[PDB]
Design a protein around this ligand. Structure first.
Ligand SMILES: Cc1ccc(Cn2cnc3c(Cl)nc(N)nc32)cc1
Ligand SMILES: Cc1ccc(Cn2cnc3c(Cl)nc(N)nc32)cc1
Length: 209
């Protein structure tokens, strides 16, 4: 069964801003999502040092970038700590309220959309390139969930019954029709080299079949 939730007002207005503001430098979404993956991997690696059983759901700590021209999706996969149901429905948004308000005020005070990560809400940069984002995620001691939103003020959460992932997060970017350059191997290599060269986990750019 599918539950539908309203975004907090401040997040809904930030998402509209990211969708409606004219900003050509859209490629920064990838740096932000890789940064989020890296942070998630840091967290589970740190926790595993006092409770090694936290890696029973998988010892590999990595990031995969998977384009699909058939599906017009770019997927960012990590084996990080994952997100709980409470994370997805309430707690990440509660944390994000402060930075979202500060980011919006900074934008009026001359700041640039590329600074979104400095306010801790970089996930929403996905809507620079995606008409819809699907997030599949699995945290130890919670179930595997699918979060999804095409903006418009609402998101859904459901228990996922696709291929179990062990632990981690998959961000599936359903790309806008004029943003398919982010399916090109060369374009992704260029972006990762430029913004993400010093990430401390293996980043594998998968190749289209
Ligand atoms: C709906 C939504 C999805 C993602 C984020 C950013 N974010 C927070 N926790 C994360 C973990 Cl554990 N892993 C990854 N990859 N991203 C994470 C915020 C809101
Ligand atoms: C494990 C992990 C923790 C924190 C982040 C940072 N981060 C980026 N975007 C975010 C949004 Cl939208 N909400 C919140 N709460 N945090 C966000 C990423 C991964």
């Amino acid at each position: 069964e599918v539950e539908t939730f309203a975004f907090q007002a401040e997040i809904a207005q930030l998402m509209s801003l990211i969708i409606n503001t004219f900003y050509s430098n859209k490629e920064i979404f990838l740096r932000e999502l890789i940064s989020n993956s890296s942070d998630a991997l840091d967290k589970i690696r740190y926790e595993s040092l006092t409770d090694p059983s936290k890696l029973d759901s998988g010892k590999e700590l990595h990031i995969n970038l998977i384009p699909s021209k058939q599906d017009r999706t770019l997927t960012i996969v990590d084996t990080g700590i994952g997100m709980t149901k409470a994370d997805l429905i309430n707690n990440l948004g509660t944390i994000a309220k402060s930075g979202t308000k500060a980011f919006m005020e900074a934008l009026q005070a001359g700041a640039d959309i590329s600074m979104i990560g400095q306010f801790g809400v970089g996930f929403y940069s996905a809507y620079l390139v995606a008409e819809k984002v699907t997030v599949i995620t699995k945290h130890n001691d919670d179930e595997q969930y699918a979060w999804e939103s095409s903006a418009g003020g609402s998101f859904t959460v459901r228990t996922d019954t696709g291929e179990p992932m062990g632990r981690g997060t998959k961000v599936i970017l359903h790309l806008k029709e004029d943003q398919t350059e982010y399916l090109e191997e060369r374009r992704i290599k260029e972006i990762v080299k430029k913004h993400s060269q010093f990430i401390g986990y293996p980043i594998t750019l998968f190749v289209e079949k």
